[PDB]
């Protein structure tokens, strides 16, 4: 075919995996594909250099980059480790001049990055900073002032330096293009007058997730200005209980006919929750993670949500609330039950294994679970696995490390074995409770589609990790803390590591000597020892490192390691 014809065929091919196969059919396709590829997804920012991406794919309009590993969320990655996006922005600034979208996760993003984005990318439309840190409201002010075509500013779970809420006032009066605004992580109060005018002049606004600083008494005002909203994150959800205030909120929310997703609810007062009831016949997503209201209050809401597909809730729901959920929400796909008091040992709520069993039995489309509880049985896990062979993500956190089945006192090996045995398309698993090498044997035998596994306080010996690396065909990320896994399984399965995004091991048994030898053996891996005790050389080769992070890369050793990171 003529090159224009082939470029046009490829315009209908947008999945990364398909673009990649295309680039490998012949030399001609390689060149044509690279020159009209529209988006790149870089799941590990250090797996490749900016120059390499920009040279290969010159016409990119959308970039997604991910930095720090998942365990950074749990304070296991010391500050300064890395993840700086500036070199990427700098490199793109002179090349990707038609650039439209930047989506970043766990990166360090500075005001200099944000200023360079504003001034470099005239067509800039989408900024998502997901669990990012290193910038302030001043950087946001630069985006607001300058990005005249901006459609999405989404700051989900980011840590922002809250210098001043004045940044939002920088959107000029001629700006009208906003579609999605998520400021839920911002501690500083924006000018409410500026927010009200912004919402009023942006008729394509579909998603508005506010910060806690917008008080419940002002919510109706904004909702009246945005009746087309599909997603709403409330601000503060507390006020003096008054008839006129409740009625105003009720009327405003009932005028929002397209609302499918509701979240926020900080400081929620039970007296004001019924105001959302009109909305909850059509709701598909409800996030009640921050509402500390009790089971019965949650049930009255949930009874009104027959179309619910995704629920995030505190363990205040309790077993009785989950039993009601199981009866009501037949389209439920995803349930996340978060701990109300994660740092207390004795239970503060009646949420046990029984709630998860109830939903597994009652919700035929339930395929994603994240569940925090204090007790579990093998019988429960076996019932779950048998009821829900369609499960694709199963994340179970028993609060006390190494807690056995509370009825039999046995490890939870057979229970998690049943999950991997019965749930053939399980892509994600996290384990907890008392676990021996046997569970890892089951995982290696049965979990052939598992891509991500998270493990803590589990196993007996290197045989455990060996079973996983040897048997888990689809494995992409393995992240382990505080397990008796060490040199033997790691080096015995070194080649497996070239088939994965990364392996994280902290507080395990891996010696500095094994890290050095692995680095020697596998020059296309970056084997990073992350250790705050000073030079690993200053200790015997046999001494375990605090952490090791290993990832395949085409770029070679990183140029930005802090003093406490060493590449082998």
């Amino acid at each position: 075919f003529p090159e224009e014809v082939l470029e046009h065929v490829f315009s209908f091919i947008q999945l990364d995996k398909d673009r990649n196969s295309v680039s490998l059919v012949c030399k001609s396709w390689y060149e044509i594909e690279r020159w009209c590829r529209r988006k790149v997804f870089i799941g590990n920012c250090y797996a490749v250099s900016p120059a390499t991406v920009i040279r290969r794919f010159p016409k990119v309009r959308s970039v997604e980059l991910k930095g720090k590993p998942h365990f950074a969320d749990f304070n296991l990655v010391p500050d300064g480790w890395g993840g700086y996006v500036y070199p990427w922005i700098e490199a793109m600034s002179s090349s990707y001049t038609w650039l439209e979208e930047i989506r970043l996760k766990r990166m360090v993003v500075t005001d200099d990055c944000l200023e360079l984005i504003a001034k470099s990318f005239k067509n800039f439309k989408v900024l998502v900073l997901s669990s990012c840190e290193g910038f302030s409201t001043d950087g946001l002010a630069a985006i607001a002032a300058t990005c005249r075509n901006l459609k999405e500013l989404d700051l989900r779970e980011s840590d922002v330096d809250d210098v001043s809420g004045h940044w939002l006032s920088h959107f000029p009066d001629t700006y009208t293009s906003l579609v999605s605004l998520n400021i839920s992580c911002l501690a500083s109060e924006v000018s409410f007058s500026a927010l009200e005018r912004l919402v009023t002049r942006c008729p394509n606004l579909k998603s508005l997730k506010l910060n806690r600083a917008v008080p419940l008494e002002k919510l109706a005002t904004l909702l009246q200005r945005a009746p087309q909203l599909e997603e709403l994150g409330t601000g503060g959800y507390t006020a003096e209980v008054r008839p006129d205030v409740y009625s105003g909120l009720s009327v405003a929310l009932s005028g929002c006919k397209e609302l499918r997703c509701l979240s926020g609810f900080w400081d929620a007062v039970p007296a004001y929750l019924p105001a959302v009831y009109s909305v909850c016949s059509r709701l598909t997503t409800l996030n009640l993670s921050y509402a500390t209201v009790q089971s019965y209050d949650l049930v009255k809401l949930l009874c009104q949500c027959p179309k619910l597909q995704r629920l995030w809730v505190l363990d205040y729901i309790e077993d009785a609330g989950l039993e009601v959920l199981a009866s009501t929400c037949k389209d439920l796909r995803e349930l996340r039950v978060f701990p109300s008091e994660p740092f207390v040992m004795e239970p503060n709520v009646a949420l046990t294994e029984q709630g998860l069993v109830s939903v597994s039995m009652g919700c035929p489309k339930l395929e994603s679970v994240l569940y925090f509880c204090r007790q579990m049985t093998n019988a429960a896990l076996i019932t779950i696995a048998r009821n829900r062979p369609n499960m694709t993500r199963f994340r179970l956190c028993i609060i006390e490390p190494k807690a056995p089945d509370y009825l039999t006192l046995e490890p939870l090996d057979i229970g998690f074995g049943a999950i991997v045995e019965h749930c053939k398309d399980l892509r994600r698993l996290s384990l907890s409770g008392l676990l021996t090498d046997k569970v890892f044997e089951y995982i290696g035998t049965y979990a052939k589609k598992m891509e991500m596994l998270s493990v803590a306080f589990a196993g007996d010996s290197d045989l455990g990790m060996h079973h996983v690396l040897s048997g888990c065909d689809s494995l992409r990320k393995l992240e382990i803390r505080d397990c008796p896994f060490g040199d033997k399984a790691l080096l015995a399965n070194a080649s497996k590591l070239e088939t994965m995004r990364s392996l994280w091991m902290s507080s395990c048994s891996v010696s500095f000597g094994a890290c050095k030898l692995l680095g020697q053996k596998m020059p296309k891996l970056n084997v990073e020892v992350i250790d705050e005790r000073g030079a690993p050389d200053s200790r015997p080769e046999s001494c375990p490192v605090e952490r090791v992070f290993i990832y395949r890369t085409v770029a070679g050793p990183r140029f930005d390691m802090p003093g406490f990171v060493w590449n082998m």
Binding site: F71, F74, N75, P342, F343, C397, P401, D482
Partner: peptide, 13 residues
């Protein structure tokens, strides 16, 4: 007590 356990983003209080 254990660092980063349970695996949540909550402040300790």
């Amino acid at each position: 007590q254990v660092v980063g356990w349970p695996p949540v983003r909550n402040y300790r209080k």
